[PDB]
Amino acid sequence: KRALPNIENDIIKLSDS
Amino acid sequence: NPAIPPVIDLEKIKFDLMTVTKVSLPEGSFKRVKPQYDEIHIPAPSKPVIDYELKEITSLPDWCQEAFPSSETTSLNPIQSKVFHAAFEGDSNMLICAPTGSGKTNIALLTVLKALSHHYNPKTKKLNLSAFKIVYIAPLKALVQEQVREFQRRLAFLGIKVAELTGDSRLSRKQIDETQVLVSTPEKWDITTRNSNNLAIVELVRLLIIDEIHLLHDDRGPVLESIVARTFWASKYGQEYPRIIGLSATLPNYEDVGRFLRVPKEGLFYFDSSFRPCPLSQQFCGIKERNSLKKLKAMNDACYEKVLESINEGNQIIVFVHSRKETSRTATWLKNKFAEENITHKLTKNDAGSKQILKTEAANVLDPSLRKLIESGIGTHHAGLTRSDRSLSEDLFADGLLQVLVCTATLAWGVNLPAHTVIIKGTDVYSPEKGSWEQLSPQDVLQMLGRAGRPRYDTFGEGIIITDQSNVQYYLSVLNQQLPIESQFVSKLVDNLNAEVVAGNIKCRNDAVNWLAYTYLYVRMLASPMLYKVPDISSDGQLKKFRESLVHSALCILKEQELVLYDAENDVIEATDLGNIASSFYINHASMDVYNRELDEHTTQIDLFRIFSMSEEFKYVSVRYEEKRELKQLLEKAPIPIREDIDDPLAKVNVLLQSYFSQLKFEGFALNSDIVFIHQNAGRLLRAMFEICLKRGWGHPTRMLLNLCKSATTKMWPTNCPLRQFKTCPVEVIKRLEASTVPWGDYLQLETPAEVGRAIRSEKYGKQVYDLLKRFPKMSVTCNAQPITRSVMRFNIEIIADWIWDMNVHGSLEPFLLMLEDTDGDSILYYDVLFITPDIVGHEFTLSFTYELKQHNQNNLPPNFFLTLISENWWHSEFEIPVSFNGFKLPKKFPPPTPLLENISISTSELGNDDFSEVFEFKTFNKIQSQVFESLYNSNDSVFVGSGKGTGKTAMAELALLNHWRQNKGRAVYINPSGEKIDFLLSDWNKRFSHLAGGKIINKLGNDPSLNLKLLAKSHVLLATPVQFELLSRRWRQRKNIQSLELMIYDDAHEISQGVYGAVYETLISRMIFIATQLEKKIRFVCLSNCLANARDFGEWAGMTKSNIYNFSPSERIEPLEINIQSFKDVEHISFNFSMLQMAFEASAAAAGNRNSSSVFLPSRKDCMEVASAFMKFSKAIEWDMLNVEEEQIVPYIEKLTDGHLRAPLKHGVGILYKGMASNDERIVKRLYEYGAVSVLLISKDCSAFACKTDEVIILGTNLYDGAEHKYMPYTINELLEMVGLASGNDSMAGKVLILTSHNMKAYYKKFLIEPLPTESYLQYIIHDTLNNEIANSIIQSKQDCVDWFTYSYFYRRIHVNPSYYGVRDTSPHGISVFLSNLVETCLNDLVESSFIEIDDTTEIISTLSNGLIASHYGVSFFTIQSFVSSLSNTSTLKNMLYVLSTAVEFESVPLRKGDRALLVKLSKRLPLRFPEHTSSGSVSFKVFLLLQAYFSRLELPVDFQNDLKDILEKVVPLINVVVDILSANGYLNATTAMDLAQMLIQGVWDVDNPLRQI
Amino acid sequence: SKNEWRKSAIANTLLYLRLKNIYVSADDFVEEQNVYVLPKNLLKKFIEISDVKIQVAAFIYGMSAKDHPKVKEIKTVVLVPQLGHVGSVQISNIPDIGDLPDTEGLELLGWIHTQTEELKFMAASEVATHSKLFADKKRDCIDISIFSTPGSVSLSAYNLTDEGYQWGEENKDIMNVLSEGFEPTFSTHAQLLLSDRITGNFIIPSGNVWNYTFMGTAFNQEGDYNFKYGIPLEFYNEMHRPVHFLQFSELAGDEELEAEQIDVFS
């Protein structure tokens, strides 16, 4: 069963156009 | 780096017998063989020669004389005088090996006293407390509690405290600071340091004394190895290491333990058996009898004969035994054995003189066997006896009545009762961990034989060991100093490795190799490579490639079991949430592997008891033949079914845990030892299982496991009555309630005490029961759903805790588990741990959060979710309530934003003037500006713009002004919520504009509304806030300068949603549209919002065409931007933690390392100071100090700086900015950052509008404390967008952002940074103010006009598209129009009741009254004047007026920080007036009341409080005038007292009978 | 002298596996006659909380959809106090739930229950318990019987004719003899649809206890009980059988323990 990582990190980008 | 180490088997490397070495006995040893048992005698060593002088107590320093009592000690110990010149004079490390005696308290005191003297100051009275603290480790609680009581009495004169660490649920954080010197076990201290949140207080520890370091050989040895390894593997946080003091037994590998503890050649001591205070002669009765009957006979005959010899010599005896029950048999067997030959002539020596003391004492004991024995002879001492009988038996032994005294293991540690001879009768002992009768361990034997030989009276001492012939060689090597202290770290390698990975110290294989260097295993592997299965010492050398292999093998086990993530090729390690549970709650890696697989969503209660039993802690547990007969009854007659048969080991652990909850007594010592082992481990193992199910979201296992956690602590089932938990409760009431089948909820709501007594049968025992029912915790929950988007759903909750807080039964912290569960109850949607405290109980408190619905629920909603609130401690204190979605209308998915035409560019030349071209600086407009330009500049249409920060939104307002001036339109107005931004624009517009046809003369407005009306006529352009202009525009019928306006520029029009000030902004926009529609005048409206979700309703409201609404996406920017959102578990109800603080510094250092400046955002000024001092550290450890120009340049700036606090931070290279402050300090700090002189810049949350701008930005913590509600409220979206907007992109690469936040807030921020948050109205809260205002100015004549008034607002638009948001049950157009009508009917009835208006029939007429006219004039809230009229009177004094003024609703915007209540109470006794009798101290009214007096008295207030005073003084002028008008309207001379108060506010002074002070 | 309930509670653990195989009859979809939509989440929980051997039953409420009037969507299952038997059950009266919120216009559709036997019709005790409840109140109610055998469940809705209400009125109690002209024809084959898009909820008694097998004489069939929205308890839950927990309470005080035996963690 897939255990999630501790200290969750969600990178977000604004590529535009 | 690509080279992967080999996957070696860790099970092979473990120790998993004596190899016939034959122990070298000392000289004078002899043997004597007998048919029953052999004997090996060794005489005691000789006393050593006096080669030195013992250091006197009086010769020590005068300040630490009382530490050693002169009557007791006289002089120092023989061994202590040798180590004094190393221990006391030297601050370096040391290890002292000696026999079990000495003065371990006194040796520790020398190291403690020198640690005190570093922070001691003879000029002061006592030493400095908060700078440091001490730690002391010791094997068991018995030895820990002894060292706490000793250190208290020893250090009594200093006033220093001492307390045992007990590992509470974050409860004893107040005492740990007050103590100063902690004492604990290895396991407690390991768990304390393992949790990385506690690393703030680890730097204060600068002395770690470790008692009995020879425990390294035992199964618990790796705990000590991890503690010492964790100490030296933590230097990057703080530079200063702590001192380590070792205390050992005289065994081999003592040099290796010194190198492990970093002990130099100076303080590496080893005193052999000769230096013991009372020399110990050994003896070993090796039993030959192999038969079981003859073995037990041989132990008795061997014990009897040695007891007989010691009495012939004339010596007292102690006889250790394996259990409580053997203690009684050994005493009575000796009594029967003596009865043949000697009888009671040898024992109880004398009659008449001696026996009279024995006779009177014999009656005192309560037990039957204890009374029978003590009269004749031979004592007894164990845990089974009461505390008095132990104290009775100990004292009479010291007097010397009883010669023999049979004892248990408890007598060795803590009791301290010396004797000449001692006998260990049988070395067999039951180990429930390994599930079999092991032999007695080395540390246990040495502690038992420590009791031998009285130092004062006896010249020498004797110690005997009765055991099997095979075990004689084992116990020879213990006493004769030939039992190697080896390392057992391979067994606990995987557990201790995972712990450091969770803490954040091991991110790769190289980190773990360096960590392993500081273990005791590493030293012993180098010393004995043959022993520890090392492949080749010559090839590896320093065991680098072996540790590479050991770490990799351990990490591969953690990878498969999913405690850590591990990419071996690239070589990177990361802890899982499952691993975090293993670390914190101290679980074995094998047990977590069982929990992860077995715990399904369908895990029933029967499965949970099985899964508990499958743990690795109960691996070696098994059933025996003698146990099966008793377990047969327990297994079949258990409450919860057990699937496993009696022969299965899992059935034994299962039934015994159930037995512990039922409180089943039984005789079997094997099982009664096993049940003790199970319930101790049960506390943390079930808690681990609970935390796994809570993370995964399995509601039914989670709720069941919470009861199993209660059962572990409380020793009871749910079906048992909750009154069992109360300590002082009648037994007759509890007994009877369990019999009668009555539901427990019925007993809570009994209001009167008479109903309780009759309901619970016993009336005499009642009344006390009525009190205890009110002490029991219960809560009134009410929840309301609120849809923002289709997917997102807000859940507003109000909670009223209803119980009287007794400090005895509760403590000071009652935790509750909040859970939002789905319709079934199986899935957990949202959860949070509430923490209730004495102050909040009784009062209501709000609570809100958001959850995103799934695709199943979005299309067709469920009927309801469930909101549960279960108490963690108390039984049957859960409160499920349904959160209804009955008739809920979800708002539809937002339409696509206005797509920018990529190939539409505009230049500055397209303006129709040469002077207009010079002002803009830049020569070409950006893509977003170029889109709006044509409709914005050339056309005079009302236009909307929705664009993110840093896209020339200020210049868009300026374009509207340029078109306005060339046409010569006339008067114009600019609006902006931020008062800071208005001050910037005024100075900028006066310079850059204000010379274009005429002069322009631009003005700012201010606090005084009379002067603002003059500034309206005086100016062409105005800048103002929503509050300033909305109040000025109220009487627009009379004021012709308001209606004559052509241009309105509403900047930050998104802020209409932001609370009451947003509703005022909405009212302003609605008013000018009402004026434009009614007076038929074309007034232009240029709204300049940020990116909204949908601007159709906004533009239609504002009076704009479909064409002129440019609502762009947040995706479209002039420069690229990349955001990073880091979550952390258990960080909801605090500002920020150490993991966030470190990751902020590392990100700031990484930004500075790439030649880019970086800013950091924090909650307040106090956070910036502490983070600044932390940033002066950290950067000390890493080679990166100051940077950016030399120290000669910064010194002249710092010397002429205003604030004293900013000298040290700005020197080391970290600028600070906070609200208020000197304009000198702002100018210096900003310009140093802009030039590139200072690297890092800490900024307060208050100064987000101060557009400093930078390459990278860091949001360290997204929480701020609110003193009114007493909650850490989260950052809003508009607050983050302000900080995110400052991140300007570089030419080489894009600008970065780092949001350090909690788990729950990531889902909100990630959603609403990409998608705009739907802009809703806040008009309904101020509906009393708006209607009353428009009634006062003769706009609203009848109540039909109130309905017509709504159609001009934004509230009327947004309530139709999203009715469920505003609490509309009937979502159909009829129900909405009914809700609008009932909103008026309810509001008008509130106004007419409080004498604001009056309604007369014979359509109606609604004339205004005195209170309504006062409210509309000064711009004060309906609720404020309502309170003022009720509170004020004909004889309300100056004191009453100041209190009534402070209770106003306008002061809710004044923030109450953490610890302001402590300052205000200290400030109040300086000030003259008193706060009213029955009113709360922790309140906003309290802060305003005192701060106004400090303003009159002119006290030097701090930087935070003087800024709060400025915010208070802004609202104070209209409110004092309201008090004057309320009094004079009724008609009192009393009004002139309020006029005297009005004078005091404008000049800032009391009426002191002295006109000269106001000058 | 038997402790035979223990095996059923163990067998109840695997009732989630029976929800893999779900069967519906669906003979001929008649447009003029009514059709009843049962949420899958109600069927999930109701089978999970029920017993493997002993019969478990409950009322059902709901209302018509906006599209069609005769499409009766089942909104709520209502568990009530009951004494379960093998192929039979003593159910309480039609519960008053007008005081609870969000209950405006809840049409009493009928009742839902488990069953040991598989049939094409309503059994003797099934028709009697239907007529005992729904004779005076509403004749056009339904009966969703669930045949739950190992590794599967089979649903079948039935509607009792006026001939059945006479026979149920005549033959009351456990058994007025073995039969008096019992017939398969008494129950008409009603339509039933299992949807997993629409969701439903549970209403339960205020005390939470609905299973009175171990409660005994506390079961009052004529009584008026209080109710609330909540997650229902399983058949052999802690609260339904408090007799086994109160076998040996003992009244034991605290114990000191040895110095080595004391907990290091504290």
Swiss-Prot record, chain A:
User: Where found, per UniProt?
Assistant: Nucleus
Q: Which superkingdom, per the lineage?
A: Eukaryota
* Signal peptide feature range: none
Which cysteine residues pair off into disulfide bonds?
none
**Job of this protein:** RNA helicase that plays an essential role in pre-mRNA splicing as component of the U5 snRNP and U4/U6-U5 tri-snRNP complexes. Involved in spliceosome assembly, activation and disassembly. Mediates changes in the dynamic network of RNA-RNA interactions in the spliceosome. Catalyzes the ATP-dependent unwinding of U4/U6 RNA duplices, an essential step in the assembly of a catalytically active spliceosome.
Subunit comment for this entry? Component of the U4/U6-U5 tri-snRNP complex composed of the U4, U6 and U5 snRNAs and at least PRP3, PRP4, PRP6, PRP8, PRP18, PRP31, PRP38, SNU13, SNU23, SNU66, SNU114, SPP381, SMB1, SMD1, SMD2, SMD3, SMX2, SMX3, LSM2, LSM3, LSM4, LSM5, LSM6, LSM7, LSM8, BRR2 and DIB1. Interaction with PRP8 is important for recruitment to the U4/U6-U5 tri-snRNP complex.
Entry's family note? Belongs to the helicase family. SKI2 subfamily.
Further facts: Present with 1440 molecules/cell in log phase SD medium.
Written domain comment of the UniProt record = Contains two helicase domains. The N-terminal helicase domain has catalytic activity by itself, contrary to the C-terminal helicase domain that may have a regulatory role and enhance the activity of the first helicase domain.
Please give the name of this protein.
Answer: Pre-mRNA-splicing helicase BRR2
Give the species: Saccharomyces cerevisiae (strain ATCC 204508 / S288c)
Upper classification of the source organism reads: Eukaryota, Fungi, Dikarya, Ascomycota, Saccharomycotina
The portion of the full protein included here is 259 to 275 of 2163
From Swiss-Prot, chain C:
- Name the domain of life this protein comes from: Eukaryota
| The MPN domain, residue ranges | 35-164
Q: Where in the cell is the protein located?
A: Nucleus
The remark listed among the other comments is: Present with 468 molecules/cell in log phase SD medium.
Q: What is known of its domains?
A: The MPN (JAB/Mov34) domain has structural similarity with deubiquitinating enzymes, but lacks the residues that would bind the catalytic metal ion.
Q: How does it assemble?
A: Component of the U4/U6-U5 tri-snRNP complex composed of the U4, U6 and U5 snRNAs and at least PRP3, PRP4, PRP6, PRP8, PRP18, PRP31, PRP38, SNU13, SNU23, SNU66, SNU114, SPP381, SMB1, SMD1, SMD2, SMD3, SMX2, SMX3, LSM2, LSM3, LSM4, LSM5, LSM6, LSM7, LSM8, BRR2 and DIB1.
Please describe what this protein does. Answer: Functions as a scaffold that mediates the ordered assembly of spliceosomal proteins and snRNAs. Required for association of BRR2 with the spliceosomal U5 snRNP, and the subsequent assembly of the U4/U6-U5 tri-snRNP complex. Functions as a scaffold that positions spliceosomal U2, U5 and U6 snRNAs at splice sites on pre-mRNA substrates, so that splicing can occur. Interacts with both the 5' and the 3' splice site, as well as the branch region. Has a role in branch site-3' splice site selection. Associates with the branch site-3' splice 3'-exon region. Also has a role in cell cycle.
Q: What is this protein called?
A: Pre-mRNA-splicing factor 8
Source species: Saccharomyces cerevisiae (strain ATCC 204508 / S288c) (Baker's yeast)
